[PDB]
Structure formats: structure tokens, C-alpha cells
């Protein structure tokens, strides 16, 4: 919804996210999936530089991604690490929503 919450929800300081811990907090509330970007914030924010009106954008570069994907057991997750481009919603020069991996 804004850059601060995008960072809380999607930027990680470790590739090896502890899915079964973080996914069970109220922010994620055991949802089926979340993608985290292992990056300093500035390379991520730069994706949206100059973009004002909300527009979905596919990264030029690839990033280290860490997906928490629910297993057959409720609120228990497999961590799946990948290198890919991703699509964000850019608004006023910062990512405000994570759209999806690989494509807009």
C-alpha cells in the first residue's frame, strides 16, 4: 500500500527466511504464499524511479527471491529460492505492491 509496508512484507535481510515463524505473524496470518526479495532497499526502490501515477513494472534486472509456499500442512512452509525478475506496482517513485514473479 506504501513503500514502508512493501519493505515489511517483501524485503529480507536473509535469503533463508524462517517461513514457519514469519508466516504465522499477524502481517502474513498463515496465508498460502509470500515472496521476499533479498536486497538492500535502494536497488528495489530504484525500479520505480521517475514513475508517478501507479503503473506495474517488470524489473530490468533479476533479484534473489525467497518464496514461502504452504505445504499440505496448514501454516507450514517450504522455502523456495530462485533468481528472477519480478513485477511491482510503482507509485510516486517507490514499490507499493508485489505483483508476481517473472512477469506482470
Automatic annotation (TrEMBL):
<keyword id="KW-0540">Nuclease</keyword>
<dbReference type="GO" id="GO:0003676">
    <property type="term" value="F:nucleic acid binding"/>
</dbReference>
<keyword id="KW-0255">Endonuclease</keyword>
<dbReference type="GO" id="GO:0016787">
    <property type="term" value="F:hydrolase activity"/>
</dbReference>
<protein>
    <submittedName>
        <fullName>Onconase</fullName>
    </submittedName>
</protein>
<dbReference type="GO" id="GO:0004519">
    <property type="term" value="F:endonuclease activity"/>
</dbReference>
<keyword id="KW-0732">Signal</keyword>
<comment type="similarity">
    <text>Belongs to the pancreatic ribonuclease family.</text>
</comment>
<dbReference type="GO" id="GO:0004540">
    <property type="term" value="F:RNA nuclease activity"/>
</dbReference>
<dbReference type="GO" id="GO:0050830">
    <property type="term" value="P:defense response to Gram-positive bacterium"/>
</dbReference>
<keyword id="KW-0378">Hydrolase</keyword>
<feature type="domain" description="Ribonuclease A-domain">
    <location>
        <begin position="2"/>
        <end position="102"/>
    </location>
</feature>
